[PDB]
């Protein structure tokens, strides 16, 4: 809508107060007009026809129940945004400033999550296997990241290359969860996932076999479920992310680690110069390599550090 740009204020699916921006033109809707051509947030209204109705609200407060997952989309895709632009010099997921949509109540009791091609979908979770699943920032940044990958590198959704894709939005939504810098961690969706378990998450970077994922090609899924294993496989990388940021020894091989940002400009790297719609774990290893090598040097520990990582993850 045309209408001037406010400021509101609500509280999240976890109860935090944060300030959201919004236009005014009548309503106060959640659409936010500071971040490139915008971002909009929208009421699916427990259906599942996409993107419902701009989110409407009389008085710019934003505290009922009903609100939260709005809140936190909102939000959270103005800290995604942010992260990619500051971080990366990266305007929006198009590089070219596209408005950002999301739609949350989407169904009834919907355990899930996506990027369906256009825009982020966000559930509501049944209560107890999760919560909104739009108070995970890590979520959230982990969606909008595949948007990232469709303009990018493309990684198609199935067996290797979709395993990447997996990883790679593992990877940068940890990323930003780390950017907020919220209670953060190399766990995936521990913030929304079973209210009623301490302690938990959806995945884990730094040791995926605590939730039956991969930390090793060798251990590589090769069935059909899950479109060949892409949330499964993806282990296999977050590993190898894990590794090259924090370091560690794993089957008895050794990475020195280099942090989260040579982490973040070695793999941004890659997703945006190398990979392609067909890139499989080799190929992401090679492309690895080459940006770090770009970035710092054949010579450097940021180079050997990332060999390390794929090594021990048994990745050549
Ligand atoms: N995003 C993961 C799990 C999230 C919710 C599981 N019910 C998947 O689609 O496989
Ligand atoms: C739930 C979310 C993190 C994602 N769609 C899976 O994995
Ligand atoms: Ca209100
Ligand atoms: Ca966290
Ligand atoms: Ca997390
Ligand atoms: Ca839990
Ligand atoms: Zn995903």
Redesign the pocket.
């Known amino acids: 809508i045309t209408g001037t740009s406010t400021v509101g204020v ?1 509280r999240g699916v976890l109860g935090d107060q944060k300030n959201i921006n919004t236009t005014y033109s009548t309503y ?1 809707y959640l659409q936010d007009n500071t971040r490139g051509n915008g971002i909009f947030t929208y009421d699916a209204k427990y259906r599942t026809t996409l993107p419902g109705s701009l989110w409407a ?8 129940s009903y ?1 939260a997952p709005a809140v936190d989309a909102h939000y959270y895709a103005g800290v995604t945004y942010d992260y990619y632009k500051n971080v990366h010099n990266r305007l929006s997921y198009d590089g070219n400033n596209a408005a950002i949509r999301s739609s949350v109540h989407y169904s009834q009791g919907y355990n899930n999550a996506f990027w369906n091609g256009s825009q982020m979908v966000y559930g509501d979770g049944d209560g107890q296997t999760f919560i909104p699943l739009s108070g995970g920032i890590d979520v959230v940044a982990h969606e909008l990241t595949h948007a990232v990958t469709d303009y990018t590198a493309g990684l198609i959704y199935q067996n290797e290359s979709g395993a990447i894709n997996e990883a790679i939005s593992d990877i940068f939504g940890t990323l930003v969860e780390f950017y907020a810098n919220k209670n953060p961690d190399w766990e995936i969706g521990e913030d929304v996932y079973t209210p009623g378990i301490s302690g938990d998450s959806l995945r884990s970077m730094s040791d995926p076999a605590k939730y039956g994922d991969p930390d090793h090609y060798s251990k590589r899924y090769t069935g059909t479920q899950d479109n060949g294993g892409v949330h499964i496989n993806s282990g296999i990388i977050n590993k190898a992310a894990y590794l090259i940021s924090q370091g560690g020894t794993h089957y008895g091989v050794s990475v020195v680690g280099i942090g989260r940002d040579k982490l973040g400009k070695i793999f941004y790297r890659a997703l945006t110069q190398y990979l392609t719609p067909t890139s499989n774990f080799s190929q992401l290893r090679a492309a690895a390599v080459q940006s770090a090598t770009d970035l710092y040097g054949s010579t450097s520990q940021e180079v050997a550090s990332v060999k390390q990582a794929f090594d021990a993850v048994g990745v050549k």
């Open positions: 609500g106060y609200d009389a008085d710019n407060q934003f505290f009922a609100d």
